[PDB]
Amino acid sequence: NMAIIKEFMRFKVHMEGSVNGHEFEIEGEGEGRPYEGTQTAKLKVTKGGPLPFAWDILSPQFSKAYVKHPADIPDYLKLSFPEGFKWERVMNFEDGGVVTVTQDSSLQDGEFIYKVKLRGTNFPSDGPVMQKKTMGWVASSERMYPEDGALKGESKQRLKLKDGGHYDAEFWTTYKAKKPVQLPGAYNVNIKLDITSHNEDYTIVEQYERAEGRHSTGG
Numbered sequence: 001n002m003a004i005i006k007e008f009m010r011f012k013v014h015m016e017g018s019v020n021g022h023e024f025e026i027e028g029e030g031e032g033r034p035y036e037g038t039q040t041a042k043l044k045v046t047k048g049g050p051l052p053f054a055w056d057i058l059s060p061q062f063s064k065a066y067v068k069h070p071a072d073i074p075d076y077l078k079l080s081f082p083e084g085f086k087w088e089r090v091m092n093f094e095d096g097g098v099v100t101v102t103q104d105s106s107l108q109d110g111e112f113i114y115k116v117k118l119r120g121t122n123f124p125s126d127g128p129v130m131q132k133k134t135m136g137w138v139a140s141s142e143r144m145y146p147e148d149g150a151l152k153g154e155s156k157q158r159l160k161l162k163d164g165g166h167y168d169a170e171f172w173t174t175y176k177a178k179k180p181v182q183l184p185g186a187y188n189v190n191i192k193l194d195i196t197s198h199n200e201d202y203t204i205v206e207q208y209e210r211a212e213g214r215h216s217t218g219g
Contacts (some may be wrong), residue, residue, distance in 0.1 A: 011030045012111060013062055022048060038066065054132050061089075064087070138159075144186060184213075
């Protein structure tokens with residue numbers, strides 16, 4: 001896969017979804033350095049905008065092939081190409097909001113192709129997601145482990161809020177390659193996800209993410 005997954009790779013992403021019944025679509029394009037763990041994405045809301053909820057609940061869904069791994073941790077999701085992988089995610093927020101997400105990743109004509117479906121439900125009409133009071137995710141760590149022939153990841157996540165407080169969530173994701181490839185043992189993936197620019201109504205957004213696998217739990 002050293003020649004399938006190049007040191008510089010682009011991707012295209014399509015998301016369709018709904019949040020508290022508001023339907024929307026997003027199209028975007030991104031690029032990054034899969035072995036250095038860095039990537040940027042430029043997203044455009046193409047249906048349903050301006051969105052009546054916080055961009056932040058969407059931002060984690062736009063790319064696991066771009067995680068830097070040490071040589072002694074098998075890079076299962078890079079190894080899955082060119083066929084690729086699928087993932088399924090549950091995000092439970094502390095005020096009862098829920099987002100469930102499914103995603104398919106493939107490689108076509110030398111670019112990654114991502115297709116995302118998202119359903120957000122049960123967010124309080126008063127809460128920070130529907131009132132657009134969130135201000136980005138704090139840096140986080142996803143604990144990974146193999147189970148039942150797939151790679152699972154779990155994390156505790158936290159959104160900063162305009163009022164200086166925080167809004168917490170738990171994330172559970174299952175990642176499954178489309179062909180048997182080697183699973184890793186347990187390890188941690190440290191992630192930093194930033195919104196680097198956006199227009200006034202978040203119908204045009206750019207993101208940057210850095211992700212790296214480690215054995216260490218330090219900081």
